[PDB]
Amino acid sequence: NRHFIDADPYPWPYNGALRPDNTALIIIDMQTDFCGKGGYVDHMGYDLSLVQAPIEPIKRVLAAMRAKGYHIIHTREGHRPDLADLPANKRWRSQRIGAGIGDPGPCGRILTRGEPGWDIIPELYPIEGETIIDKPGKGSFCATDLELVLNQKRIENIILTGITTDVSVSTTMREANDRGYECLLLEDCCGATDYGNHLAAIKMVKMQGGVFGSVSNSAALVEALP
Amino acid sequence: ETNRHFIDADPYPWPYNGALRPDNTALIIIDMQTDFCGKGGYYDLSLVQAPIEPIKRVLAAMRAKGYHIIHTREGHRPDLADLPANKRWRSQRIGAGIGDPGPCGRILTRGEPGWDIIPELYPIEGETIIDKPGKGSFCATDLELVLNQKRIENIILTGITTDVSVSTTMREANDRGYECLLLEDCCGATDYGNHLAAIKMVKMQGGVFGSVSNSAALVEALP
Amino acid sequence: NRHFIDADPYPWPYNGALRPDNTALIIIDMQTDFCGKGGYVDHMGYDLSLVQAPIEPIKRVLAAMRAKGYHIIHTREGHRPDLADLPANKRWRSQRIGAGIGDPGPCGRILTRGEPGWDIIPELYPIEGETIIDKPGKGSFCATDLELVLNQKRIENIILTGITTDVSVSTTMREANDRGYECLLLEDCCGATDYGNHLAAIKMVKMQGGVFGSVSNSAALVEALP
Amino acid sequence: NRHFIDADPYPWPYNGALRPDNTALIIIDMQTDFCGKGGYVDHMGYDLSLVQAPIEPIKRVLAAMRAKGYHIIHTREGHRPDLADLPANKRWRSQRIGAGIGDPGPCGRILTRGEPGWDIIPELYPIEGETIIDKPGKGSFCATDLELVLNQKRIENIILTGITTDVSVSTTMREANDRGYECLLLEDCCGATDYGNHLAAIKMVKMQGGVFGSVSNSAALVEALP
């Protein structure tokens, strides 16, 4: 029994092997630091409405996938309080633009694990049974146990959502795809610091017959999810 | 006194800390392979051929000053043991099936003439070649191990395509703490707008993936 | 200018480049689950005195290295409460011998993160500025950020201590060594489920001119540490 | 549909899911450098009879597993001819004992890819369709594509053979086990530089209800292989 989600450039997953047991949702970096007042992204002066836009669509996808027993994974980008996992270049760049990782702000130390700004927003909070990946980079595979977790759960398909489209979401999709995972990006469930870069990161997926996977949207996914 | 040097770059002069030396810096030339950019293989080559002469100039300058040089080739073992099923299916669907015969041999298959690096940018002895089964040069390779034994800190990225293997390689390197410079006239893509956008993505958030420069600025300031 | 610790089969580190800035202590898995009453190792019926023996020697090494400003790393083997990072074989084997990972015991769920038995023992507890690695396997590199952290700190030399000698300690040493790190095993600062396997894991290091590194002891280290 | 091989400490694989499509033999480092006159191990003065002993048992296992269509994997430890993948400590230790990696010997440059001494021995040579892993370390996973290959082949179970028991074989088993692969070590199909270390590496597997997997022998495997 095959099932597909209408998607561009091909119906997804490629082979129609779409089941709760072999499919995970990943919700990438929906943290106050990336989409809320007083955090990292706000300190850089970007338009928060672009990264808040995906909240309600993700909420709908999350509710549907929880109700149908799909695996749910959440990521949080951040650093130990001792900053041992913070590259010096990453830190310096953030300080140069007045959004220093580990520096005090209105929601605590920016992008620092255990601080209020770093946590996942309440609207998309994890519940019992859902894996949280704490990552020190943009890619969710680099220096984490995500791959190990996917393999123990025998996950083949990944549905990607979160922020930002062109940074953590795209990097995560590229890493997953290289390792053979079959990935669907939900375009209304991501957002970026620049709308043009958001659209372009989406278009990049579709080139060469779906070089990184395929693209769909929250309504299409929720309507056809088995 | 200080050995501090910078290349003019956007959004910040690179490398961030000015620690720019032959011993801690590599050029990487990504996937300049016959099937993707050379006369015959695997219609429009113009956008992926454009970077050849700028890369040639950067390569010559960095060789002359004793910098580390690294080359990549995307490809698969001839038995296709390292080829994901989704990757294969997609390539077949668009009539460019990995491992299938084409005019320069089996497409994206190691040891085939089309898969090799173009003669204009061919490696010489002492330059490491990374053979990779994915877009990112770190995934399933020994690149990280090699960088670490050479104590490389700074990487200058060139090659094709800007938005696929180049960008992915830059993101992987960046996440691991490497300080990366993308040379915008030394890369190209299948779609010029995606090329420009992959470049712009580097610069956001004060240089989220590193910084961006060009062949002339590099050659003018390389120590 | 060069400094060496007396060690077998060669004075360590190989090149004498021994400094606080390029050297870390790692204290592996000194958790109640591995060395205390009521935990995983106790449930399997092994002799706790073998894995408690290293506590005082480690304490001495830790005090000396803290006082001289060396980087300090601690590991904890364990699993998320949802057990997503627990391989099915690992779990089955632990259940078959009556020491089931995730199953309730006198110190909480065995080898489960957040449970009392899982935490590092108070005698060797981390202080601020010391990195903790949470690992789902025996090797400290597998599915962790340890390599990322070592690289940002520019660590070249690693001094290994903890438990068990032949399992997590040896595996960690082998991983580190393969990646080019220069490793010293402190033989009186480790212990095992079997004393003979402890001795054998130590001897394995020394073969082929120090195939995994070199071997010393707490007193030799403390006496010559720069 | 379940099938088991008689093994210690438990019948293997744990769940009986033993099939040609999900099971590989790995033959580790059966190269002239490790078991032949004039190579690396011979230069260090170790007794070649210990590392030659496993050749006939491996030959039998290889023949049986080829005849039944199981996946076959081979490894070779070695270095790129420019030595870009050779750690400085690894090189220094090999030079100190008169067996310098990359230095000329009677079978070519020691442990250097493309040299006669480095190649797999004729008695156990690969045939087409059997993946060869070229590794710069002891562990077959470190800096290779082995994990990617195993995952695309959907391999779950690995049968380990080769040399040396306590170095490359044990390291590879520990890496695989940590990632959730189900591993069987064939004790008569490995050997080491020290017989006691060989026996101890085997015994280490069996502790804690099969901490690294299980242990059997060539005859038991061949008799019960489905």
CSV table of C-alpha atoms in Angstrom, one decimal, chain A residues 72 80 82-89 113 128-134 136 142-146 148-150 152-153, chain C residues 71 80 82-89 113 128-134 136 142-146 148-150 152-153:
chain,number,residue,atom,x,y,z
A,72,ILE,CA,8.6,13.7,16.4
A,80,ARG,CA,27.0,24.9,26.8
A,82,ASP,CA,31.2,27.1,29.4
A,83,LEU,CA,31.1,27.8,25.6
A,84,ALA,CA,33.3,24.8,24.9
A,85,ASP,CA,31.3,23.9,21.9
A,86,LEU,CA,31.3,27.4,20.4
A,87,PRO,CA,33.6,28.0,17.6
A,88,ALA,CA,35.6,31.2,18.0
A,89,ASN,CA,34.6,32.5,14.5
A,113,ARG,CA,21.7,26.2,26.9
A,128,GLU,CA,6.9,13.1,26.5
A,129,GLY,CA,8.1,10.7,23.9
A,130,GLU,CA,9.6,13.3,21.5
A,131,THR,CA,13.3,13.5,20.9
A,132,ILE,CA,15.1,16.8,21.4
A,133,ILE,CA,18.4,17.3,19.6
A,134,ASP,CA,20.7,20.0,21.1
A,136,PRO,CA,26.1,23.5,18.4
A,142,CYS,CA,27.0,17.7,12.9
A,143,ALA,CA,28.2,16.7,16.4
A,144,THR,CA,24.8,15.3,17.5
A,145,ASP,CA,23.2,11.9,17.9
A,146,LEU,CA,20.5,12.5,15.3
A,148,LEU,CA,22.1,7.3,15.6
A,149,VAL,CA,18.5,8.1,16.7
A,150,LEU,CA,17.1,7.9,13.1
A,152,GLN,CA,17.6,3.0,15.7
A,153,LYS,CA,14.0,4.1,14.8
C,71,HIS,CA,40.8,21.6,30.4
C,80,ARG,CA,17.1,9.9,26.8
C,82,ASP,CA,12.2,8.1,25.5
C,83,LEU,CA,15.0,5.6,24.7
C,84,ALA,CA,15.2,6.9,21.2
C,85,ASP,CA,19.0,6.7,21.3
C,86,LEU,CA,19.0,3.1,22.7
C,87,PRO,CA,19.9,0.4,20.3
C,88,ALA,CA,17.5,-2.6,20.5
C,89,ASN,CA,20.4,-5.1,21.0
C,113,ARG,CA,19.4,10.5,31.8
C,128,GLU,CA,31.8,25.4,36.4
C,129,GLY,CA,33.9,25.6,33.2
C,130,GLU,CA,34.3,21.8,32.8
C,131,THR,CA,32.6,20.1,29.8
C,132,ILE,CA,30.2,17.2,30.2
C,133,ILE,CA,29.7,14.8,27.3
C,134,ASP,CA,26.5,12.7,27.3
C,136,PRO,CA,24.6,6.8,24.1
C,142,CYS,CA,30.3,8.2,18.8
C,143,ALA,CA,27.2,10.5,18.3
C,144,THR,CA,28.6,13.2,20.5
C,145,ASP,CA,30.2,16.7,20.2
C,146,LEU,CA,33.5,15.6,21.8
C,148,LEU,CA,34.0,19.4,18.0
C,149,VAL,CA,34.8,20.5,21.5
C,150,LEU,CA,38.4,19.2,21.4
C,152,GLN,CA,37.7,24.3,19.3
C,153,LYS,CA,39.9,24.1,22.3
